[PDB]
């Protein structure tokens, strides 16, 4: 009845003429601003660690960031993070299969789709609450804080 369905995923339809799709830049900027990510390539999201940190933001208590590897460097480390994440999906009842065996690969295509839908899928649940991604793994202020600090000067000229 009324009671329940508290923490569920609001499927995404968007079945209409209108079509709002972002590009490599944006697609990344969205996440880089969501949980303060520094991904320079959509393929980077392959790690999954990002998708895992999102579940906690939208649906708290559904995903375990502890079992997630934000420092994942190898391929196997990409699957592990996805594993725990998959739980958050079935936990609520997400009918969006998570292609890890592929996502891990680190492709630029199979990724675009996932993330592409990961955006609208976040707005269908995100009402307007503040979520601190850092506080999730905060310890000693000393440690180097994550920042997009990146700039490369260039541009040859002849005169």
Q: What is the DSSP string of 4-68?
A: ---S--------SS------HHHHHHHHHHHS----SSGGGGGG-HHHHHHHHHHSTTSS-TTS-
Is 146 inside a domain boundary?
A: no
- Which H/E stretch holds residue 135? none
Residue 24's φ and ψ, nearest 5 degrees, are -40, -60
CA distance 66 to 71: 12
Asked if residue 12 belongs to a domain, the reply is: yes
User: 86 phi and psi, to 5 degrees?
Assistant: -55, -35
Give the Cβ contact number of residue 117 at 10 Å: 13
34 in any annotated domain: yes
| CB neighbourhood size of 59 (10 A) | 19
Q: Which domain holds residue 61?
A: 8-137
Q: Tell whether 154 is covered by a domain.
A: no
Which residues are within 8 A (CB) of 110 and not within 5 positions of it... i.e. 6 or more apart? 99, 102, 103
Residue 106 CB burial class (10 angstroms; 0-12, 13-18, ≥19)? middle
The CATH number assigned to the domain holding 64 equals 1.10.418.10
Q: Is 150 part of a structural domain of the chain?
A: no
Domain count, the chain: 1
85 located within any domain = yes
Breaks in the chain (C–N beyond 2.5 Å) sit after: none
Burial of 155 (0-12, 13-18, 19+ CB in 10 A): exposed
Experimental method: NMR
Whether the CB-CB separation of 13 and 19 falls below 8 Å is answered with no
| Tokens, residue 7 | 């923490």
**145 belongs to a structural domain:** no
Distances (CA, A) of 40 to 13, 25, 97: 29, 8, 25
Helix (H, G, I), strand (E, B) or coil at 2: coil
Does 14 map to a domain? yes
């Amino acid at each position: 009845g009324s009671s329940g369905s508290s923490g569920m995923a609001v499927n995404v339809y968007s079945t209409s003429v209108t079509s709002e799709n972002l590009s490599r830049h944006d697609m990344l900027a969205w996440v880089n601003d969501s949980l303060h990510l520094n991904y320079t390539k959509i393929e980077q999201l392959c790690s999954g660690a990002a998708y895992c940190q999102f579940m906690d933001m939208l649906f708290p208590g559904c995903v375990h960031l502890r079992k997630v590897k934000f420092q994942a460097k190898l391929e196997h480390e990409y699957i592990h993070n996805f594993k725990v994440l998959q739980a958050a999906f079935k936990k609520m009842g997400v009918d969006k299969i998570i292609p890890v065996e592929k996502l891990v690969k680190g492709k630029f295509q199979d990724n675009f789709e996932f993330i592409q839908w990961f955006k609208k899928f976040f707005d269908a649940n995100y009402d307007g609450k503040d979520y601190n991604p850092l506080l999730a793994r905060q310890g000693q202020d000393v440690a180097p804080p994550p920042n997009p600090g990146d700039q490369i000067f260039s541009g040859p000229s002849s005169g």
